Amino acid sequence: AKKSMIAKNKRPAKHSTQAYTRCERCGRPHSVYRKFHLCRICFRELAYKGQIPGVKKASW
Amino acid sequence: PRKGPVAKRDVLPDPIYNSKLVTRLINRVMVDGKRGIAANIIYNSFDIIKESTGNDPLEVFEQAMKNVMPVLEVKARRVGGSNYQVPVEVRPERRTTLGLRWVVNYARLRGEHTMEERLAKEIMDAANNTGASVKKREDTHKMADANRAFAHYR
Amino acid sequence: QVQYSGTGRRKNAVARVRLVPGTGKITVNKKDVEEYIPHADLREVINQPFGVTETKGAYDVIVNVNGGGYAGQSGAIRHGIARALLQVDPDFRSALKRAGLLTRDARMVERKKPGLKKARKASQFSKR
Amino acid sequence: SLKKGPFVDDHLMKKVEAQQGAEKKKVIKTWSRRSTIFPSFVGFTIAVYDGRKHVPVYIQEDMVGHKLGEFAPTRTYR
Amino acid sequence: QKIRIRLKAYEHRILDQSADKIVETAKRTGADVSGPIPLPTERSLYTVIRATHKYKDSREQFEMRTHKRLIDIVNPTPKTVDALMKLDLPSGVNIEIKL
Amino acid sequence: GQKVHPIGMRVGIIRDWDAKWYAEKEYAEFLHEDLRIRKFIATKLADAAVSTIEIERAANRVNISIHTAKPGMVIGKGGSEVENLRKELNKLTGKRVHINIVEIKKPDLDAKLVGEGIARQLENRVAFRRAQKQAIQRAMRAGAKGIKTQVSGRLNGADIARSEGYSEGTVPLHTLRADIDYAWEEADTTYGKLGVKVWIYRGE
RNA sequence: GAAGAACCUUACCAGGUCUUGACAUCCUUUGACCACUCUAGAGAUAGAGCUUUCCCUUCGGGGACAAAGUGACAGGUGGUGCAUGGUUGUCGUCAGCUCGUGUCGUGAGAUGUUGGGUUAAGUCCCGCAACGAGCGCAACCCUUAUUGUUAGUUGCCAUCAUUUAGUUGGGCACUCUAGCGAGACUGCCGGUGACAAACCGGAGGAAGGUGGGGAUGACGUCAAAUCAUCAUGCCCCUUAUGACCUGGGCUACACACGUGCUACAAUGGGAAGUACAACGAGUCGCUAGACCGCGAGGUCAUGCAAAUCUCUUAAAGCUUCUCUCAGUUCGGAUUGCAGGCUGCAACUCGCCUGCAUGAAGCCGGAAUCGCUAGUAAUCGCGGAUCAGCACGCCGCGGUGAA
Ligand SMILES: [Zn+2]
């Protein structure tokens, strides 16, 4: 029930408090980094492949 | 714990009396890391010591140690599924720790309005066979030797 | 004239000790001895290297301390002074190594672990 | 706290107006959620909508401060 | 004087190799370049839980790291401006010049 | 499941990323544009089957480059397909893309190509044990220090899933002076879906 | 799962509704649409209005585009984790798990991997028909603990002057910033031990016995969890279990259980004056200063795309008075009134301020939980998602135990 909703979220909103955040390549409503427009776990998958610049592992 | 004996952490002496015993006395008053308040009310306790029947500011603490410090305690050393606790001589550092516990950790119960009359006069009282911590040791020795016969062979 | 150097560090607090032949005091951040160092009794704490080297004075002390909490930045004053007393005379380094007051406390706040309440405190877990 | 006055929608006003000199009508079908009451709205008879039912209620002059949301209890605890 | 540039990248080796190249080309036609002043190197963290449905009691994190260098130039020639506009590469660092 | 993508362990230490950017205030636009860039080689991968694409970036230019083992279909007949791919990529980009072709050597010692080939034998109903063994031998014939292999799912068109794989040579997995590779690829003949994994090791 | 439920969020309801469709690909007719004002309404929509639009012209045409026809088709957050891939818990950072060659056994197989010592460990020495190797363990990685070189602004002030003021003249001296480097390996000595591994002390040093932490999770177990991130074998729905909109609900409460916050006051409450951190964030974002307000705050405005400007002068801290043991100047829930802020809109259902109110609660049975040192205990601060909303989560720092 989301292929209509992803196209719903590409439209200009009816008013200001409707343009929420979801992921781009998937459609998750929860836990999306707005700096990256990715969810928690597609970010995790692309983080290992060296396909996101910046990000490394973090030990200190 | 399981493998061998552990180290025991000797401490630093005072900034005034140069005492490790009074330092340990401060550290069994200290709650939530507030050391300066407990240290300052213990110096206030020494000031109450010095005025009312001022004899020696530290000998009164050593006589408070005199009338409290144990020599005996039972310990549940069963062997084959029994209840034969043995009155056993105590380690000397645990002995002094039980003494500090019976002095300070019983002094919550005086209930007087001035906040260190339960401290200063309380350790004044323990110098000369008064204070209920002496009779704590008395009843501790009396419940000791209750199995003097059938436990001292182990 | 000549001045005597020294530095001391503890508990994420750093100090720059500037020892001068004086009368025996300390000025910290252009203030007095116990205006910026509050009610704490930490005088013979700081004067404990003086009790093993040049008892008790008479050298005034300049220092500009910053960072950390008050007791940690107080304890770092001890080590720039002892480093300075090593700078003056070699004949006290035995008297310092018997007394310590030279080894930096490397022990500071411990890293947490993502998954607990604290650095080692675990949450309550009901068995039944 | 609505410091710049009351709030009543303008697509609430458009059912009837000519009941000012005559005896009022009975049908007021609405949504009855957002709009508060201010004294020009006294003594009507409104079918207050509670998500399922435009429940009829008429107005007293001291049922006057709160919105139209007191009289749409959407819990059904019986 | 009328020039100071900035360096921001991710890898300090690429930073100081390109910084040594531009210091080598700095007093070529000019003079009196200031060296590679370091900068406190801002850092971020994140938090991603190691599951897809549950299990928040085990997590995972990453980091952003932004290394920053700084090279100042005092009393320059006019000839180094057209020289430095002929200097364009590498591409891993982005310069930030003023006048 | 507990293990880690090993290229996500060694990155930053003994290799780098595949996007050498440094971008503020236009970062996610280029991220979800590079996401579109990676998808477009599905036209390649049926025939050209490249392994990695390194994407560097100038001020206003796009400067990409690929690695592959098959230089035939990617260079076209006379480079005419190359400019067509530049045009079709620029139609999605609008920006000056300047593509490049770099040929890999000792091509059997990849990660993605070997797993893609054994998934190709799985997509023609060829038996999994013999294909894995001849694959790890022909990778050992290339000259290496070790290959690990594992396949899972409903094996060989059967019922409830098993998972089994074979290995030879040495493979220090838990060590950081490693320089190893890794690749995962799906597989399906018609039944369900399968998966292959593949490993090499050649010293630091 | 939920690292942010007023509408949206949504899949759950009452209603208003629609159909090659809310979304994808081709065909022709055609080619480019739109966008915006007025009326109806709760909205989807309906009826008008300005007109739409060629980016090759070799009169020959499709690329940016709509509408119509049906044709292909689309769509399912519907089922099956016991048909799946991928991913993750748990034993558990437990110390195991195997191979080649040579031997033993008629044979399945065994020995190596057993015994003595020692260790955090299949870590190492000695005897042993076994000799060697691999995946694990350890090492290489990150941070913290000293110091050399290099480079000195937006950093610091020692050699002097100034100014509220390291400000401005000046220096890179100290500090700091972070690149390249050195440094801790039983390294030396003494005892114990079969002289062997190893154990116990000493000197040196910043740390001496893997210095302190982190990342790193073998063979395998539990048909453990997941079609509701994703992909998907098979089965079912299709003028509808698919789609658009309004309003409601997941925030109920006769009850029982788990997890956290605040108290039952004198190491304390209330009033006054008075100091020292660390991490990180900032363009439609943080706010300097000023004026006014009991306040939540309101207005004019200055710096800031950053070691410079702001968040931001931290709380426990320290000194004086206070209260005098009470259900109390403890406690701070509940309830009327008055407000402030973002939101189109705080009734269902945001946060905060002020006035009036002031309940339980004086350390909690049976039982049960966490923790061996910068730890436990207490105290503040920052960030994610975010118009708005945190006693939750992630991270830092102060005081500092038995
Ligand atoms: Zn995603």
Coordinates of N, CA and C (backbone and C1' of nucleotides) in Angstrom, one line a residue, chain G residues 34-71:
Chain G
rC34 P -3.8 21.0 -19.9 O5' -3.0 22.0 -18.9 C5' -2.8 21.8 -17.5 C4' -1.3 21.9 -17.1 C3' -1.1 22.6 -15.8 O3' -1.2 21.8 -14.7 C1' 0.4 23.5 -17.5
rA35 P -2.0 22.3 -13.4 O5' -1.4 23.8 -13.2 C5' -0.2 24.0 -12.4 C4' 0.2 25.5 -12.5 C3' -0.8 26.5 -11.9 O3' -0.6 26.6 -10.5 C1' -0.2 27.2 -14.0
rC36 P -1.8 26.6 -9.5 O5' -2.5 28.1 -9.7 C5' -1.7 29.3 -9.5 C4' -2.4 30.4 -10.1 C3' -3.8 30.7 -9.7 O3' -3.9 31.4 -8.5 C1' -3.7 30.8 -12.1
rU37 P -5.4 31.6 -7.8 O5' -5.9 33.0 -8.4 C5' -6.8 33.8 -7.7 C4' -7.9 34.3 -8.6 C3' -9.3 33.9 -8.3 O3' -9.9 34.7 -7.2 C1' -9.0 33.6 -10.6
rC38 P -10.9 34.1 -6.1 O5' -12.2 33.9 -6.9 C5' -12.9 35.0 -7.4 C4' -14.1 34.6 -8.2 C3' -15.0 33.6 -7.6 O3' -15.9 34.1 -6.7 C1' -14.6 32.9 -9.8
rU39 P -16.4 33.3 -5.4 O5' -17.4 32.2 -6.0 C5' -18.8 32.5 -6.4 C4' -19.5 31.3 -6.8 C3' -19.6 30.2 -5.7 O3' -20.5 30.4 -4.7 C1' -19.1 29.3 -7.9
rA40 P -20.3 29.8 -3.2 O5' -20.6 28.3 -3.4 C5' -21.9 27.8 -3.6 C4' -21.9 26.4 -4.0 C3' -21.4 25.4 -3.0 O3' -22.3 25.0 -2.0 C1' -20.5 24.9 -5.2
rG41 P -22.3 25.7 -0.6 O5' -22.5 24.4 0.4 C5' -21.4 24.0 1.3 C4' -20.8 22.7 0.8 C3' -19.5 22.3 1.4 O3' -19.7 21.7 2.7 C1' -19.2 22.2 -0.9
rA42 P -19.2 22.4 4.1 O5' -17.7 22.0 4.2 C5' -17.2 21.2 5.3 C4' -16.1 20.3 4.8 C3' -15.9 20.4 3.3 O3' -14.8 21.3 3.0 C1' -16.4 18.1 4.0
rG43 P -14.0 21.4 1.6 O5' -12.9 20.3 1.9 C5' -11.9 20.1 0.9 C4' -11.8 18.7 0.5 C3' -11.8 18.5 -1.0 O3' -10.5 18.5 -1.6 C1' -13.4 17.1 0.0
rA44 P -10.3 19.0 -3.1 O5' -10.5 17.6 -3.9 C5' -9.6 16.6 -3.7 C4' -10.2 15.2 -4.1 C3' -10.7 15.2 -5.6 O3' -9.6 14.9 -6.5 C1' -12.3 14.3 -4.1
rU45 P -9.6 15.6 -7.9 O5' -10.8 15.0 -8.7 C5' -11.4 15.7 -9.7 C4' -12.9 15.8 -9.5 C3' -13.6 16.9 -10.4 O3' -13.9 16.4 -11.7 C1' -14.4 17.0 -8.1
rA46 P -13.4 17.4 -12.9 O5' -14.8 18.1 -13.3 C5' -16.0 17.4 -13.5 C4' -17.2 18.3 -13.1 C3' -17.2 19.7 -13.7 O3' -17.7 19.7 -15.1 C1' -17.6 19.9 -11.4
rG47 P -16.8 20.4 -16.2 O5' -17.9 21.2 -17.1 C5' -19.1 21.6 -16.5 C4' -19.3 23.1 -16.4 C3' -18.2 23.9 -17.1 O3' -18.4 24.1 -18.5 C1' -18.6 24.8 -15.0
rA48 P -17.3 24.7 -19.5 O5' -17.6 26.2 -19.5 C5' -16.6 27.1 -19.9 C4' -16.7 28.5 -19.2 C3' -15.5 29.3 -19.2 O3' -15.3 30.0 -20.4 C1' -16.3 29.2 -17.0
rG49 P -14.0 29.8 -21.3 O5' -13.1 31.1 -21.2 C5' -13.7 32.3 -21.0 C4' -13.1 33.1 -19.8 C3' -11.5 33.2 -19.9 O3' -11.1 34.2 -20.7 C1' -12.2 32.5 -17.7
rC50 P -10.4 33.9 -22.1 O5' -9.4 35.2 -22.4 C5' -8.8 35.8 -21.3 C4' -7.3 35.7 -21.3 C3' -6.8 34.6 -22.3 O3' -6.7 35.1 -23.6 C1' -5.8 34.4 -20.1
rU51 P -7.0 34.2 -24.8 O5' -5.9 33.0 -24.8 C5' -4.5 33.3 -25.1 C4' -3.6 32.3 -24.6 C3' -3.4 31.1 -25.5 O3' -2.0 30.7 -25.4 C1' -4.2 30.3 -23.5
rU52 P -1.2 30.0 -26.6 O5' -0.1 29.1 -25.9 C5' 0.1 29.2 -24.5 C4' -0.6 28.1 -23.8 C3' 0.2 26.8 -23.8 O3' 1.3 26.8 -22.8 C1' -2.1 26.3 -24.2
rU53 P 2.8 26.8 -23.2 O5' 3.0 25.5 -24.2 C5' 4.2 25.1 -24.6 C4' 4.2 24.6 -26.1 C3' 5.0 25.4 -27.0 O3' 6.4 25.1 -27.0 C1' 2.9 24.9 -28.0
rC54 P 7.5 26.2 -27.4 O5' 7.3 26.3 -29.0 C5' 8.4 26.4 -29.9 C4' 8.9 25.1 -30.3 C3' 9.3 24.9 -31.8 O3' 10.4 24.0 -31.8 C1' 7.7 23.2 -31.2
rC55 P 11.6 24.2 -32.9 O5' 12.6 25.1 -32.2 C5' 14.0 25.0 -32.5 C4' 14.8 24.5 -31.3 C3' 15.0 23.0 -31.2 O3' 16.1 22.6 -32.0 C1' 14.2 23.8 -29.1
rC56 P 15.8 21.6 -33.3 O5' 17.2 21.5 -34.0 C5' 17.3 22.2 -35.3 C4' 17.1 21.2 -36.5 C3' 16.3 21.8 -37.6 O3' 17.1 22.5 -38.5 C1' 15.5 19.6 -37.0
rU57 P 16.8 24.1 -38.7 O5' 16.1 24.2 -40.2 C5' 14.7 24.4 -40.3 C4' 14.1 23.0 -40.4 C3' 14.4 22.2 -41.7 O3' 15.6 21.5 -41.6 C1' 12.1 22.1 -41.2
rU58 P 16.5 21.5 -43.0 O5' 15.5 21.0 -44.1 C5' 15.2 21.9 -45.2 C4' 15.2 21.1 -46.5 C3' 14.2 20.0 -46.7 O3' 12.9 20.5 -47.1 C1' 16.4 19.3 -47.3
rC59 P 11.8 19.6 -47.8 O5' 10.4 20.1 -47.2 C5' 10.0 19.7 -45.9 C4' 8.6 20.1 -45.6 C3' 7.5 19.2 -46.1 O3' 6.3 19.3 -45.3 C1' 7.2 21.3 -47.1
rG60 P 6.2 18.5 -43.9 O5' 6.9 17.1 -44.1 C5' 6.2 16.0 -44.8 C4' 7.2 14.9 -45.1 C3' 7.8 14.2 -43.9 O3' 6.9 13.2 -43.4 C1' 9.4 14.6 -45.6
rG61 P 6.3 13.5 -41.9 O5' 7.6 13.3 -40.9 C5' 8.0 12.1 -40.5 C4' 9.0 12.3 -39.3 C3' 8.3 12.3 -38.0 O3' 8.2 11.0 -37.4 C1' 9.7 14.2 -38.2
rG62 P 7.1 10.7 -36.2 O5' 8.0 11.0 -34.8 C5' 8.5 9.9 -34.1 C4' 9.6 10.3 -33.2 C3' 9.2 10.9 -31.8 O3' 9.2 9.8 -30.9 C1' 10.5 12.5 -32.9
rG63 P 9.0 10.2 -29.3 O5' 10.5 10.4 -28.7 C5' 10.7 11.2 -27.5 C4' 12.0 11.9 -27.6 C3' 12.0 13.2 -26.9 O3' 12.3 13.1 -25.5 C1' 12.8 13.6 -29.1
rA64 P 12.3 14.5 -24.6 O5' 11.8 14.1 -23.2 C5' 12.1 15.0 -22.1 C4' 11.1 16.1 -22.0 C3' 9.6 15.8 -22.2 O3' 9.0 15.1 -21.2 C1' 10.2 17.9 -23.3
rC65 P 8.0 13.9 -21.5 O5' 6.6 14.5 -21.3 C5' 6.4 15.7 -20.5 C4' 5.4 16.6 -21.1 C3' 4.0 16.0 -21.3 O3' 3.2 15.9 -20.1 C1' 4.6 17.2 -23.3
rA66 P 2.9 14.5 -19.6 O5' 1.4 14.2 -20.1 C5' 0.3 14.5 -19.4 C4' -0.6 15.5 -20.1 C3' -1.8 15.0 -20.8 O3' -2.9 14.7 -19.9 C1' -0.7 16.5 -22.2
rA67 P -3.2 13.2 -19.6 O5' -4.8 13.2 -19.6 C5' -5.6 14.4 -19.7 C4' -6.4 14.4 -21.0 C3' -6.9 13.1 -21.5 O3' -8.1 12.7 -20.8 C1' -6.0 14.3 -23.3
rA68 P -8.4 11.1 -20.6 O5' -9.0 10.7 -22.1 C5' -10.2 11.2 -22.6 C4' -10.5 10.6 -23.9 C3' -10.3 9.1 -23.9 O3' -11.4 8.4 -23.4 C1' -9.2 10.0 -25.8
rG69 P -11.2 7.0 -22.6 O5' -11.1 6.0 -23.9 C5' -12.2 5.9 -24.8 C4' -11.8 5.0 -25.9 C3' -11.1 3.7 -25.5 O3' -12.0 2.7 -25.0 C1' -9.9 4.6 -27.2
rU70 P -12.2 2.5 -23.4 O5' -11.6 1.0 -23.2 C5' -12.3 -0.1 -23.7 C4' -11.4 -0.8 -24.7 C3' -10.2 -1.6 -24.1 O3' -10.5 -2.9 -23.7 C1' -9.4 -0.1 -25.9
rG71 P -9.5 -3.6 -22.6 O5' -8.2 -4.0 -23.5 C5' -8.3 -5.0 -24.5 C4' -7.0 -4.9 -25.4 C3' -5.7 -5.1 -24.7 O3' -5.4 -6.5 -24.4 C1' -5.6 -3.3 -26.2

